[PDB]
Design a protein around this ligand. Structure first.
Ligand SMILES: CCOP(=O)(Cc1ccc(C)cc1)OCC
Ligand SMILES: CCOP(=O)(Cc1ccc(C)cc1)OCC
Ligand SMILES: CC(C)OP(C)(=O)OC(C)C
Ligand SMILES: CC(C)OP(C)(=O)OC(C)C
Ligand SMILES: [Zn+2]
Ligand SMILES: [Zn+2]
Ligand SMILES: [Zn+2]
Ligand SMILES: [Zn+2]
Lengths: 331, 330
């Protein structure tokens, strides 16, 4: 509750500083990176790409990033540790399950999944001794039975460890509502959960409803936009057609209603991406050359130029993250 | 002339008694490294594997083909380690089964071709261990992805000479569509083994494929839920046909003159996480002999039913060697 686990070890709350709460070094699949490294050029190249990108964010002031890649996202902790050490940026690793779990998981029970999540947070990931500092879960519209189980196990592990929960939603379908439901049914405090991909909807009504209950709202895909790239059906399907300004304004909307303490902002960027069409990255890097630095460089000043006081900006990027990430046990 | 094993190349003559469809562990990609305790421990699994392989060895088995693909959680390093301890040759595989992740499902036929060749020519992961066979699958009518897979499989095979082995839903006659696709890519049937064939009682479906030149895989002989019907999961997986019935299919094809087209295995495993928890315990109760089941029980049974030893020797020694030998097209 005093220290936060990173792939380099524990750090104190003050050490975290400017923190990006939903990012990825690589978006892939379990075992993929070890089996076919050439799909990304080479492991060495994915790594140099990541270090450069991370150095750039650090220059703009980023000190910590939370890589929310789960086992099924193809998380490679060794990879995380190596770029973390090289770029000198702290990286928080995750446990949980995304939406592409293999058979060996789909068949597990809630109790077995609970153990698995606990193993990762308390014992370490694989045989590295590296501990996860966050649990990631997801739904794609109406939850599946399996998904239901996932949410429950995430809640149990969190209750037992004090580590927070972060989710992937289909904002459009108001997933957040169903997720809150399950978590509360487990006794988990909304203050330990972040409902992500929220900037993906314009429904301010949905957002404040959640904000109002004590949840954290993740506005994490700021730079995601296929505007001008309407040519590409695939890019458009992923990126959406709302501009980044539209997304950034939600941030101001929430502040305005008085929810500055429940806002978490991120880019949801990546340096590699195998779980999608081939060459989607190329397209992405074209739309956002700034990568992870996009927030500090572009969103921050923009929000400033619109009436938001710097100090408020500092609380959303430093203060909220710290409070969220510190392991906290229920009274 | 030389077959690729997890310990290196071997000459055809060293293969000897070969079991063509087995598994050291039946899991998922990354699973064993992430949650070894699910199996007791990695060390425990390994030790179990070494034991049962030494027993099979005792009985005469010299080589085993582990048909575990990437998505089956194949761990080449585990394989090498137990091959070394037991002193049994193990042949590894490339290909895809029916649980591919997004990263795989989204690739093109050309991409898939590359991955399979990589595993066969360059090696598995970073180990340098080369695959000696390609495993594919269908579970009834092929999906479009599955179609691509079968195509890339056929292509990798043509370029390398390495045989192809498949999983099928025998009862749905999957073999027929697989052949159609394979033939369309130019692949010769003699390079292909249509697996799980013992899962059907339809002799006509089997003789037709044999006639065309395919190898028939009669590989789940010991799989039977007979007396375990109180267990639905178990029964769903093992079936309720007895081991004798499966074995007889072997005699049935010999009798039709296709002994040269027959391949026999157990489809056994020492670890199994892609199923209900505790299935292994059920399985080990059903077949204490493990992989030695073939030699200790099927051979003697067949001999007793009138099959000449020598014929038996052709099936377990000669057929595999021919199948396994990397064969290029004319
Ligand atoms: C064997 C995996 O460890 P374990 O069962 C018990 C365990 C937890 C933490 C440490 C430091 C050692 C051992 O993990 C807890 C869920
Ligand atoms: C995986 C990178 O190697 P490669 O492109 C070419 C390659 C094949 C074999 C050997 C021994 C070295 C290199 O793999 C074959 C498709
Ligand atoms: C793959 C897409 C469709 O979903 P997402 C945005 O959670 O992917 C992660 C890996 C960024
Ligand atoms: C339902 C699945 C588990 O069938 P199968 C027989 O191909 O599994 C292998 C890994 C033994
Ligand atoms: Zn997501
Ligand atoms: Zn993400
Ligand atoms: Zn099979
Ligand atoms: Zn099998």
């Amino acid at each position: 509750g005093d220290r936060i686990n990173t792939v380099r070890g524990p750090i104190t709350i003050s050490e975290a500083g400017f923190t990006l709460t939903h990012e990825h070094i690589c978006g892939s699949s379990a075992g993929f990176l070890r089996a076919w490294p050439e799909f990304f050029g080479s492991r060495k190249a994915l790594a140099e790409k990541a270090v450069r990108g991370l150095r750039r964010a650090r220059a703009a002031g980023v000190r910590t990033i939370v890589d929310v890649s789960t086992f099924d996202i193809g998380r490679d902790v060794s990879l995380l540790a190596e770029v973390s050490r090289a770029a000198d940026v702290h990286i928080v690793a995750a446990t949980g399950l995304w939406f592409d779990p293999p058979l060996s998981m789909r068949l597990r029970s809630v109790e077995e999944l609970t153990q698995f999540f606990l193993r990762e947070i308390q014992y370490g990931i694989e045989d590295t001794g590296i501990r996860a500092g966050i649990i990631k879960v997801a739904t794609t519209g109406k939850a599946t039975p399996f998904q239901e189980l996932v949410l429950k196990a995430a809640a149990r592990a969190s209750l037992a460890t004090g580590v927070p929960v972060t989710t992937h939603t289909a904002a459009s379908q108001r997933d957040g509502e169903q997720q809150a439901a399950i978590f509360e049914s487990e006794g988990l405090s909304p203050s330990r959960v972040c409902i992500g991909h929220s900037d993906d909807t314009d429904d301010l009504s949905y957002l404040t409803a959640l904000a109002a209950r004590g949840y954290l709202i993740g506005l994490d895909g700021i730079p995601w936009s296929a505007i001008g790239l309407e040519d590409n059906a695939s890019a458009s399907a992923l990126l959406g057609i709302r501009s980044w300004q539209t997304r950034a304004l939600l941030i101001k909307a929430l502040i305005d209603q008085g929810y500055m303490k429940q806002i978490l902002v991120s880019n949801d960027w990546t340096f590699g991406f195998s779980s999608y069409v081939t060459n989607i990255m190329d397209v992405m890097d074209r739309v956002n050359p700034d990568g992870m630095a996009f927030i500090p460089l572009r969103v921050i000043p923009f929000l400033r130029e619109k009436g938001v006081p710097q100090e408020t900006l500092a609380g959303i990027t430093v203060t909220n993250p710290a409070r969220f990430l510190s392991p906290t046990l229920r009274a």
